């Protein structure tokens, strides 16, 4: 089934390209106490996402199908919220990608089982994408991770209010 | 005039981001005799465009204004044709970016004079973007450049028909 | 079942070693308009094939079995056509490896399922070999890939005749 | 007018050397929640400032005039406040360089127009210095940049009081 | 099942950390004819084990669970013999890690199937750990590997007695 | 006195190995606002500690005595508190290593004088270890260093309570 | 005979300097289907020619004689046709250097025997120059090399006419 | 005006190519006390001149015009004295390039204003060439720069006679 | 005589390709006390042999003749014994390549004189191949080299029997 | 005694910062026959001085005290002559740093004994600073070092008068 | 006392230069089972010895005294046995440097106390030389280090006789 | 004739080792105006001489003969003057190596013809040694090379007297 692997590959590529533009957008406009920390972290996320975005589209051509990474396709086949414009707060960026990475990781997790029987090599690549996406999810989640000595509500980065 | 420099910077960033996704799209789906030549050349163009896309948005924040590099903004503030989907021919890719680079370079050329008096530092960056865009225009134009011994109609890469 | 993993590993190693000598042979004797393009591309294919040839034989020793990479074994356990001698045409090289990579990739695809239950780690390596082989198949296939504006018959690289 | 370019070059060099010693001073003595973040950021600012300090003095010798980068000249031709001694707070460092970079950038902006007609090459260098200084100004300003979801008063890094 | 992946990941991490300290211990105290050969080989094993020890604990945090790599946990959740103290003989080091790598590799092999259905991405990482552990097992086993012309009893490295 | 230098070297090695596992443990499980800052800082501390851990054990073999870096020895010859398990708060990590580095540095300071007369070369190495340990102590202490404009109580990273 | 080695060395240097300016000239002005392929290939030829141009003149000074690499000497001691000006066709560039490299290689081949008896070290250098020149001749000749399946007349790169 | 930018670009390229061959000529044949100092300095000048020679010709093709870097053009469009042949004295080399760099820098300075209105991007490149040429002029001028304690007549490098 | 240089070049290439597959075969299957020592040494030999195998075939194309490096040609134009299959003993590997390198070096030594008069450049390359082959012969011969204090019979690596 | 180590560390840092600005000042304005030789040598001295200036201030924070590297402190806690302004002669620069390095080295030599008992680790760093300062003193002293065949009065670099 | 530091420095330099030529001599002529192991190990020892040989002589010039590293001085101020000529056995090389490194290390240990009071910086360098020499002593001693399971008599590398 | 190649190789190695110690000796003790210039130049000569010293001895072992690079052999098989001790003048160093390099180069030139018939590969290496030795001879000779505008008597570096 070539159509099945294309669906899993093309859907993953569009999500990676969406995260590509969103990580870079927050990379430039993040503000607050953790602006520079997230500035550097989002650039590393961008480079890891961009690398796998190349691999996914390369895998699309490898199985004999075209790759659609156009701007209209990113907006069209959205299915994910768009990052807000203007200056972004550090606490807002942390909460945005905490949910975005988790949502993308869960979708990739399902696509792995959809193609594991017909295309284990493509499923191997999708597992590697799920690995880096869930790792990035942890790196955003750890900012507000509860500990025995501190719930880490994020009040210090959100004008005194829990995030 | 902060509004003038933002207009020149934001308009250039959106065009660079459009070329970013278009060079990479042709990078993966180009086909024909010159597919691998353009594959490598488009990746170099992508890296040069991406680097200046970072500098332009960085200059936006440097003058005190937010940067809009979101996917919807690329589609919204288009003003440039979209690259076709599916498998792309090498002759089609050459002619697409020959006109696209030239159109972008002419617009950047006008923005340089619009901000040279109020923001010479930003105009200095826009000149550097115009330099790399017009250089890429030559690199696409040279495929069909007429010579005394050969008009270079591109018939060999376009099913026997002049491009 | 140690015998099953050895069969899949040893058969893949011999095919990689055959492609090793064939890519390098075409690397030196390719001729025509695309001689230098294929010269560089075949060297990259050679380096990727050689690296995985090391990994496959290393995996053979890791599971406790000897590795047979001798010259007589490459000729003996052939099951693949031999590249022609003498000066090779660029269109001939493109069509040779288009079919050779596809044939090798299909065989590796079958070996993955043969060992996925008894040796998932070896199957993981075979998936990585299938990934690079099918990627190389695309890189040879793209020279003659049909497009909406051009069928890309390869007449320009084959003395006016469709390849 | 050689005297005009020397004035713009020598005044810029002294300001860069002042920022050189001030960024490094805060680099070692910064304290608080953002001490290590600023520690790394100030070292990058120091390296960029030092590089352009070399270029400015090199340009001075290139136009045929001596370069005065002595310690007494930094103190003499001050015209900028001195960074406080002892342990420095992170919020204090952020506010110090937010104003210092902006003041230096505005002065360099004026010097560009003073020499653009008689020495466009020197004005080109001064534009590059203004670029990196205003970029560093943004990197300090972003710590307290107001956002729709958070004014970012810096209370968390200033003992509960808005910075 | 989060508990299942944590069990496989945490158990593998403790075994890797045990091999970490054991390879380094033998790295410093190995003696005999093959002391320097094993000195270098054990350092390479240490670097490969340490890298995957980072990946395993990183995967633990990625799936949302804490990582226990404390010294007491290495001793507590032992289940593997401790390397002897004092000066170690080369033949003793070869036989120690021949069995240790094999025991660890067999356990990781079982954990792959335990989590392959619920967490294929984690199973993908465990397969990579099993790959490097079984490769290191071969590198220790080859010192005493029987050949048609020599049984390789190791008498030369064990005071004239077969190892 | 060989026994004196062994005592100073072996005791320092065990403390370095304890800090090795503790910095890496906090490196993976740190949480809160400063989780990523400490994540990077603890990895640099880990690399510096690991390098000197190699030098100390190498010096042990150089003076003619075995090196004991086994896991049981780290737990046995403890004399330092164990880092807590589970998710660690950033303020908890800062206070843990502030005291741990200081305690280790004071012990190494005493060992330098114990061996300076009989083994100045070993004392030279112990001085280098004390240098990097006290430097790391400052890097943890600076998070809560009092300043004229801010006492830096750490309330922002400790749920509103002074650390 | 110092005069004999100077003649062989000085004549080779002038030919290398002529090829230096000619490869770079075609590097910038080549046009057609193979413009970018030759653009890259001519830059590699330029770097290899320039390196040996340094070695030849260095050998001239080593044997105790001055080196004449002036522009007038390149034009004066020509004895080779000049590359045409303006935009150059890819087929024209291929045929120009196919004959130019061959002519230079044959002359260097004769100079090797002229100095092999009196200056074997200089003859050793001239052999290395002949090696790289004849290698470059093959790299230009392979574009039109006849094959059993294709004569490679170059009609596709020469407006339908055999080159 | 395309003709205006071509004139400024082509005239600068020929002067750079002339300095290219002249710096390298003096690089090999310089003699005296400062032969090795100038040997190294002239090689650095050669690399900087060669790099900008590439950029100038690349800019020529970017604006849509051919580039003439042939040997006959260097001799034809001379307008600069030729470096003497044979062994060159260090004092002679210093005085030759002191005037040559200054003459070239003054001409480039005039071309910047000739094209600043019609082609600011090309004028930006010409400013960068003027920067490196005037920097090299200082590096040659400093050998004989008068000081309060020493006029630096160069008598020590010119057989006792002031240069 | 083109036929003479082709004979010397083609015969050397086939021998290098035979040693290529044989060094790599022993690289993977060597066993015994010196397995890892030879494992590393054979990989270095493989890289040196492979590099000169490229140069020899490149020289074949440079003189205008095709290069035959196919697998069947390695087996056909053998004239050298084949390395045994299965697990190889370290003493067996040492004795195999001691004779193999010597036999290849003697043949290359004869080919140098066969082509030194008609093709000194090719003879220069064959001398470089003889240099690396005879160097590798020494590196295998030194394992059993007799010394005044020890005949080095290899009994320790050959089950107590002299090799 | 914390006050003792601070005195030795702070006094050394100010002297290093003074040499920092003085080496760089002479680096840009040195003139005469040895201008370029000293230009390069002073840049190497600057990099070595700057590196130890970082280490000294880092050691200050490591022992728990603030670091004062401000411009006013360099001028205030002077105790060393200031380098002259304007163009500097090479002989003047050589004699300036010959005495300056020696004076700084003697002071650091005394501080080593002042803190060797209370702070051997800090004394270890001060010894390393004395090492590089006395090495730089030799590198300036060697220009006028007397030899059996030449007193090296420096008349050639000082307008015919002994330095 | 300048004479005291010169004595310790000059005596150490001559011993390092003696070990320099001896390690390299054994590096080329070592034979037996461990020839290649010692070949690599002796090259690393040579590089470490050569580096400190540079530092010692550099320290000699730094304190104001000439450095005598001539060949006659190595033979004259010998006081160490000369390595035998001809082919050297591996067991002979191991025993030669086991005693040579120990003898050199003991002498350097005494020189440290001779100059620690008058020249602590030089004593610091001599401690670093003693560190690397005693480390190399361990690396040679470990070949015959006794273990609980094996006395490691070296019979396997010494024709069946204990070394 | 093995004895002939050994004679040429061993004699060249001893001369290279003599120049090794002499270049390094002058590298440390050179004095005068050109001390630092020669300091750097002699270090480059040392590295080139040392590299070929390794190749020569490696070639000795490759042809089956031992290599004698001991200190006594350098003094014994001298046949070259010894460099003077103590502080060396720059003019003395220039004249010493001008004659030393020339004498060594002439001897190597004769050895090439002595072994060219029996050992062309060894003669190829000796030609490469003669190349670097005669190049170094030029680099020392150029300091006093006569020019049309200056005889370059070296009076400025030799207390007013011609060298
Ligand atoms: Ca898998
Ligand atoms: Ca994988
Ligand atoms: Ca906030
Ligand atoms: Ca400008
Ligand atoms: Ca610029
Ligand atoms: Ca086409
Ligand atoms: Ca063809
Ligand atoms: Ca604060
Ligand atoms: Ca043993
Ligand atoms: Ca917290
Ligand atoms: Ca054409
Ligand atoms: Ca002169
Ligand atoms: Ca054996
Ligand atoms: Ca002077
Ligand atoms: Ca000390
Ligand atoms: Ca030290
Ligand atoms: Ca032996
Ligand atoms: Ca030859
Ligand atoms: Ca050669
Ligand atoms: Ca002198
Ligand atoms: Fe790609
Ligand atoms: Fe950025
Ligand atoms: Fe391998
Ligand atoms: Fe500089
Ligand atoms: Fe990590
Ligand atoms: Fe180690
Ligand atoms: Fe050169
Ligand atoms: Fe170029
Ligand atoms: Fe090749
Ligand atoms: Fe620092
Ligand atoms: Fe040195
Ligand atoms: Fe060697």
Short mmCIF file of N, CA and C and ligand atoms in Angstrom, two decimals, chain A residues 124 128, chain C residues 124 128, chain E residues 124 128, ligand 2:
data_model
loop_
_atom_site.label_atom_id
_atom_site.label_comp_id
_atom_site.label_asym_id
_atom_site.label_seq_id
_atom_site.Cartn_x
_atom_site.Cartn_y
_atom_site.Cartn_z
N UNK A 124 10.18 3.03 10.76
CA UNK A 124 11.40 3.29 11.51
C UNK A 124 11.73 4.77 11.53
N UNK A 128 11.68 7.63 14.76
CA UNK A 128 12.72 8.60 15.06
C UNK A 128 12.16 10.01 15.17
N UNK C 124 16.32 -4.05 12.33
CA UNK C 124 16.48 -2.60 12.38
C UNK C 124 17.61 -2.14 11.46
N UNK C 128 17.51 0.12 7.79
CA UNK C 128 18.37 1.26 7.46
C UNK C 128 19.07 1.06 6.11
N UNK E 124 12.75 0.84 19.65
CA UNK E 124 13.77 1.18 18.66
C UNK E 124 15.07 1.58 19.33
N UNK E 128 18.90 -0.41 19.48
CA UNK E 128 20.20 0.22 19.26
C UNK E 128 21.16 -0.06 20.41
CA1 LIG M 2 17.25 3.51 13.83
#
